[PDB]
Design a protein around this ligand. Structure first.
Ligand SMILES: [Zn+2]
Lengths: 78, 30
């Protein structure tokens, strides 16, 4: 079931995560918070030229095995 | 070309991973 994905920063390191296609974008941000200490409200996740909405799943966005997403950091905006 | 260069930050990306490069350049806009 599960699979690994990567989350790249703009100019730093890359994060490796273990996920399932049924995982929501909100879950993935939780997993980053677990591995890096970044709250989800400070995280924009990007894939294929757009930011990803929290309540949608990876399979929803056609995110597959070994895909690389991008993490752009932010302050909490409302 | 073997590699691409980000036109904004000068990071180098292998040309074979084109979605990842394009996403990187997109993320500058954000
Ligand atoms: Zn760049």
């Amino acid at each position: 079931g599960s699979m690994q994905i990567f989350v790249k920063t703009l100019t730093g390191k890359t994060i490796t995560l273990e996920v399932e296609p049924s995982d929501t974008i909100e879950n993935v941000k939780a997993k980053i918070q677990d591995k890096e200490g970044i709250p989800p409200d400070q995280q924009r996740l990007i894939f294929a030229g757009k930011q990803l909405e929290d309540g949608r799943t990876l399979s929803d966005y056609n995110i597959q095995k070994e895909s690389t997403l991008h993490l752009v950091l932010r302050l909490r905006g409302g | 070309p073997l590699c691409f260069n980000c036109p904004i930050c000068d990071k180098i990306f292998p040309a074979t991973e084109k979605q990842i490069f394009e996403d990187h350049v997109f993320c500058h806009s954000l």
